[PDB]
Amino acid sequence: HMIDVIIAGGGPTGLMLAGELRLHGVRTVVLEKEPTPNQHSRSRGLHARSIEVMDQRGLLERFLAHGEQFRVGGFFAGLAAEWPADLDTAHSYVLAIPQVVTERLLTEHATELGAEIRRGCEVAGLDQDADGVTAELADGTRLRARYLVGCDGGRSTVRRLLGVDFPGEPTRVETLLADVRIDVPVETLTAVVAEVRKTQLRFGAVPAGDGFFRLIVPAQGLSADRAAPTLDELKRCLHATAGTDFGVHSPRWLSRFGDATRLAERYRTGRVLLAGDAAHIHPPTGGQGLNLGIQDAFNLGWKLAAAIGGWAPPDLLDSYHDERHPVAAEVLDNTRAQMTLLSLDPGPRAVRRLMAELVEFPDVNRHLIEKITAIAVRYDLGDGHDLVGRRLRDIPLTEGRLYERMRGGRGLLLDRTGRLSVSGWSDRVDHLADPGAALDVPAALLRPDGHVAWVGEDQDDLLAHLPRWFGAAT
């Protein structure tokens, strides 16, 4: 019938959201401005919680088929350190996979599930009322739906049109990124990079396989125009930072970015929501935007589908803002911390030497990696038990593993007591009755995003907790 949800923007956030909505029959149209997929790959991989999320939906096998697992140092502000031996996840690794391939994989999955991706379609305006949202496209055509989600990136058109304030710290430091060929061998390049880095940690060089290299080099001041830089400006900035320009020539990508950290004041404005870079910006350098955007979509999907299905309780959609807005605030702040630790100044450099001492302690190294990989996220769901609000890691069952049972994106009561029941909610919550499950609690109610809503062994207590995330008994 009518479109249920329109998603502005077909990046990883919107695509992951499209997939989550299609698990529940939601008619979903992604409006993506560009007529062909973008080929400039941003992130080089995925962290554990994103890896876990893919596995909960059955996508990890294809992700591992298109990537390489590794466990090396340096993921927090570039501080080299052994991989934490006791990270609290069954997916304790980093998945090296270009974001272009991540976007392809999410596009194929969204399409195979029946999301309608429309390329060449730019949202230019919106008009919402009590029953839905009309998106106005740049060619004058109009689309109606029940909800509209702005997943349209850091310069979100939806955010601007809503007037949602974007407070934070403005850009004070700019950085250039170029994918260019060089007139010197690779060995010369990497030797100079290793040397410059001892002074200037913001400089970096990563080969792509085809003789192109990705160069990251500080800009000279801020720019008046905030536009893309020219090859000559790249040479100016390379000369100042490294002494040589390595004969950079024939760019295939020239870009600029700032260290601004901004956070949308409201993730929800009536029937219109924001997710991903549309809801928060922060530097690509030490940022986590790809993971953060995917996990915004993972938080919002089942809740918005519940709204469409008619069973969402009255505060459910608002729990999206209430849970994900604090998470982004902490990512933004921790990324500011990391940028400082990369600074040239003698003060920050002294702090960096201290941090290097501290990361030799396993519980520091574990603390920093669990933070940035997002496995440590805890929503405040108002209970004392430590598990409540955290995502439950994958655990062995009698046969199989917990994440194998989550592919429908529904709720899950993991019950070892042999006694509890979610009858009245079975259409929304499965009953995983397995006393051999390797979890040292009597039972735990898991929301569709894997976050623990409740731990206990009393049926009446279980019943009192169900309506909050799963609505009324039917």
Ligand X SMILES: Cc1cc2nc3c(=O)[nH]c(=O)nc-3n(C[C@H](O)[C@H](O)[C@H](O)COP(=O)(O)OP(=O)(O)OC[C@H]3O[C@@H](n4cnc5c(N)ncnc54)[C@H](O)[C@@H]3O)c2cc1C
Instruction: List residues near ligand X by CB under 6 A.
Output: 8-14, 31-34, 42-44, 99, 122-123, 151-153, 157, 177, 276-277, 284, 287-291, 293
State the binding partner of 152 from ligand X, its own copies, none, CB within 5 to 8 A by kind.
ligand X
Closest to ligand X by CB, 11 or 448: 11
- Secondary structure class of 32 (helix, strand, coil): strand
Shortest spacing between CB 363 and its own copies, in angstroms:
5
364 binds its own copies, rule: CB under 8 A: yes
Q: Which of ligand X, its own copies, none sits in contact with 56, Cβ below 5 to 8 A by type?
A: none
Q: Which does 291 bind (CB under 5 to 8 A by kind): its own copies, ligand X, none?
A: ligand X
Shortest CB 282 distance to its own copies, Å: 11
- From the list its own copies, ligand X, none, partner contacted by residue 8 (C-beta under 5 to 8 A by kind): ligand X
Closest CA to 430 of 416, 447, 453: 447
Shorter beta-carbon distance to its own copies: residue 178 or 374 = 374
User: In whole angstroms, what is the distance from residue 180 CA to residue 207 CA?
Assistant: 10
Gap between the Cα atoms of 222 and 220, Å rounded: 7
Which of the choices ligand X, its own copies, none does residue 289 contact, using the CB cut-off of 5 to 8 A by kind? Answer: ligand X
Cβ 32 to its own copies, closest distance in Å? Answer: 35
Q: Name the CA radius of gyration of the chain, rounded.
A: 23
Show the binding pattern over residues 324-353: x = contacts its own copies (CB under 8 A), - = does not. ---------xx-xx-xxx-x--xxx-xx-x
Q: Which does 12 bind (CB under 5 to 8 A by kind): ligand X, its own copies, none?
A: ligand X
**Does 166 contact its own copies by CB under 8 A?**
no
Work out what residue 150 binds among ligand X, its own copies, none; the CB cut-off runs from 5 to 8 Å by kind: none
Nearest approach in angstroms of CB 83 to its own copies is 18
Q: How far is the CB of 291 from ligand X (least distance, A)?
A: 4
Edge-to-edge order in the sheet of strand 94-96: 45-46, 94-96, 68-70
Q: Which residue has the tokens 């396989």?
A: 209
Choose from ligand X, its own copies, none: what does 44 bind? Cβ within 5-8 Å by kind.
ligand X
Q: Which two tokens stand for residue 253?
A: 């990508």
Cβ burial of 209 (10 Å; 0-12, 13-18, 19+) is exposed
Stretch in the footprint of its own copies (CB under 8 A) among 89-97, 103-111, 320-328, 359-367: 359-367
Q: Least Å distance between CB 81 and ligand X?
A: 17
Question: CA 206, CA 190: separation in Å to the nearest integer?
Answer: 9
Which residues are paired to 7 by β-bridges? 30, 149
Side-chain-facing half-sphere of 251: CA atoms under 13 Å: 19
Q: How far is the CB of 336 from its own copies (least distance, A)?
A: 4
Is 169 one of the binding residues for its own copies (CB under 8 A)?
yes
Burial class (CB in 10 A: 0-12, 13-18, 19+), 374: buried
Nearest to 3 by CA among 37, 43, 30, 41: 30
Strands 45-46 and 204-207: unpaired
> Residue 353 is encoded by which pair of tokens?
């030497």
Residues ≥6 apart with Cβ < 8 Å to 310: none
Beta-carbon count within 10 A of 105 CB: 20
**Residues that bind its own copies in the complex, under the rule CB under 8 A:** 169, 333-334, 336-337, 339-341, 343, 346-348, 350-351, 353-354, 357-358, 361, 363-364, 367
